[PDB]
């Protein structure tokens, strides 16, 4: 309690303070309102990818023992991708077993941007989309762009 959540709150504050002093190009993020444990963030469709032009919204939920356990990050915007599902769950190592205190929310959003550029079709949350990525990359890129025009612009 007290001490655990003070350390987390000190750390969340430090990450927020760093975002304000040195705003990053790949995302923007901050508290929804009063509660420092609940943020929202945006990601820009990376320029080279089929998601270009789109703005994708996520929620970020810090646990009480942050940063020793990872935040919970989920898309709220619909996105066509093998490693992200209907509910906006994201298959990414560093959000589970590979989590380290050295990572920040900003670095995680960066890695998620890498996931949009270079999907991982061998660990698929959505097998259907994964099979399309594997056996017809042109169809995949078309549908990705279609969903980006439909939901993220």
């Amino acid at each position: 309690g007290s001490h655990m959540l003070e350390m987390a709150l000190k750390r969340i504050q430090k990450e927020l303070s760093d975002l304000q002093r040195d705003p990053p190009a790949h995302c923007s993020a901050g508290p929804v309102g009063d509660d420092l444990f609940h943020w929202q963030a945006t990601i820009m469709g990376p320029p080279d990818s089929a998601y270009q032009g789109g703005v994708f919204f996520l929620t970020v939920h810090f646990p009480t023992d942050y940063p020793f356990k990872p935040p919970k990050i989920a898309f709220t915007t619909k996105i066509y991708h093998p490693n992200i599902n209907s509910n906006g769950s994201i298959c990414l190592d560093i959000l589970r077993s590979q989590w380290s205190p050295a990572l920040t929310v900003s670095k995680v959003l960066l890695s998620i941007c890498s996931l949009l550029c270079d999907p991982n079709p061998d660990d698929p949350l959505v097998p259907d989309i994964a099979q399309i990525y594997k056996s017809d990359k042109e169809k995949y890129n078309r549908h990705a762009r279609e969903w980006t025009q439909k939901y993220a612009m």
Binding site: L19, Q20, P23, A25, S28, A29, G30, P31, V32, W39, Q40, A41, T42, M44, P47, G53, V55, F57, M153
Partner: protein, 73 residues
């Protein structure tokens, strides 16, 4: 007060504003400096989509805050 606007290229724009200025007013200032039409601009502040008709104060944007600018296509 001053606020900053980050763009997709990495460039930062600097704007002189008041807390009562509407998002429209800020889009107008951006047009002046960069020539991007307001109807093409999407502004974001710390994860939140900024809409027309609301003030900087309504979104708790403060001295030296930094918004992000995206374009519609």
């Amino acid at each position: 007060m001053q606020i900053f606007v980050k763009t997709l290229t990495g460039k930062t724009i600097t704007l002189e504003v008041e807390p009562s200025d509407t998002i429209e007013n800020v889009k107008a200032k951006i047009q002046d400096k960069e020539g991007i039409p307001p109807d093409q601009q999407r502004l974001i502040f710390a994860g939140k989509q900024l809409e027309d008709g609301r003030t900087l104060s309504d979104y708790n944007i403060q001295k030296e805050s930094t918004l992000h600018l995206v374009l519609r296509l």
